[PDB]
């Protein structure tokens, strides 16, 4: 059934033409023009369902009609016929769902969503699983004297919001650097990022002190050694170094020529807080090493920024679009709609808008 939703979703996406004004749309908005349909008390879902519409979850951080969201309710409305098709083809299907990179969720059967509802669909274990390949992360945290204040408290929050985006195939470690360098975790190599092993990291990160002098050369040279150590038992995939520095005038040019000649380590760099320092070199480290510079003003931007780092890791997958569509099942988790333990099957939907004609291909 996934192949049917992935084949139609892409087909409809090609004929779209990007409407800009919207004086013509009518979706459901399951959190409360719009619809108010009939409900059947149904027992496979243990709950009231509709069977005639898909519902929509737009997270309450987003929305007014902003034409990125509002345009994506347009072409996604087509998946209505194919959601409805699969109930007649085989009953006892549970929630079909199209998640989307802008945060919406269409899910048939439509149903009232369950004070604040946080629920970003783009950080759901069933999305961060079939949206990238497994990941040998390594988090470097500038713990020098210059991070103290606000911009440290944002790092202790943001690592704890970073590590939630790891599945159970992914590996991490957390390493501070300052005068010298050290893996303030009690592990000294790469771990498994279980439920349990991520808790040791959340007590190590929350007891960071801030003092010393930045150097960036004893730091990165400790980072590329950790992404060696083949001894361990890593996953052998996307190698990521992520950098939670505030600023500094140091292009570490002597280090990436030492270790990244083959360009096989993506370096995402974040620069947190409202420091008035030089963001110049930190933007440089990420645009030489296939990385992507992000920026974090304050609390609140943390939930949106530390999930867009998976759109970079999807870049190798989209270039093999004939054979990257495997189905990738997620290992067991409790449903957000109150259903029980559920296991999901996922499949990515990629943007086909010039193909076989090929095109500038932007």
């Amino acid at each position: 059934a996934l192949v049917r939703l992935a084949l139609e979703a892409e087909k409809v996406q090609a004929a779209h033409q990007w409407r800009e004004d919207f004086a013509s749309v009518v979706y459901y908005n399951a959190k409360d023009q719009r619809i108010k349909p009939v409900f059947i008390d149904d027992a496979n879902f243990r709950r009231q369902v509709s069977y005639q519409h898909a519902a929509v979850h737009i997270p309450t951080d987003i929305y007014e009609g902003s034409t990125i969201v509002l345009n994506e309710l347009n072409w996604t409305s087509a998946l209505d016929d194919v959601f409805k098709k699969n109930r007649e083809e085989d009953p006892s299907l549970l929630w079909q769902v199209f998640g989307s990179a802008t945060g919406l969720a269409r899910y048939y059967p439509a149903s009232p969503w369950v004070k604040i509802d946080l629920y970003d669909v783009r950080r759901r274990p069933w999305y961060i699983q079939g949206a990238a390949s497994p990941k040998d992360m390594l988090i470097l945290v500038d713990v020098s004297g210059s991070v103290s204040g606000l911009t440290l408290k944002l790092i202790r929050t943001s690592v704890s919001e970073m590590l939630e985006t790891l599945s159970d195939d992914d590996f991490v470690n957390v390493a501070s650097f300052n005068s010298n360098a050290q893996d303030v975790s009690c592990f000294q190599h790469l771990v498994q990022a279980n439920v349990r092993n991520k808790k040791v990291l959340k007590d190590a990160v929350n007891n960071i002190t801030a003092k010393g002098i930045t150097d960036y050369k004893k730091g990165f040279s400790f980072a590329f050694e950790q992404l060696l150590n083949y001894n361990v038992s890593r996953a052998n995939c996307n190698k990521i170094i992520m950098l939670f520095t505030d600023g500094g005038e140091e292009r570490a040019q002597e280090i990436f020529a030492k270790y990244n000649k083959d360009k096989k380590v993506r370096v995402f760099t974040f620069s947190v807080g409202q420091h008035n320092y030089d963001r110049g070199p930190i933007q440089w480290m990420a645009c030489e090493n296939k990385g992507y510079y992000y920026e974090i003003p304050s609390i609140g931007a943390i939930r949106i920024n530390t999930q867009e780092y998976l759109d970079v890791l999807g870049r190798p997958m989209v270039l093999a679009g004939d054979k990257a569509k495997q189905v990738q099942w997620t290992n067991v988790y409790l449903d957000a709609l109150e259903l029980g333990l559920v296991i999901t099957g996922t499949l990515p939907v990629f943007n086909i808008t010039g193909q076989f004609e090929n095109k500038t291909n932007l």
Binding site: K290, Y293, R315, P316, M317, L319
Partner: peptide, 17 residues
């Protein structure tokens, strides 16, 4: 798992920013 996907020749890294 056995699949995995990394480092095509194309890609074209000219965004970041």
């Amino acid at each position: 798992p056995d699949v995995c996907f990394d480092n095509n020749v194309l890609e074209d890294y000219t965004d970041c920013x």
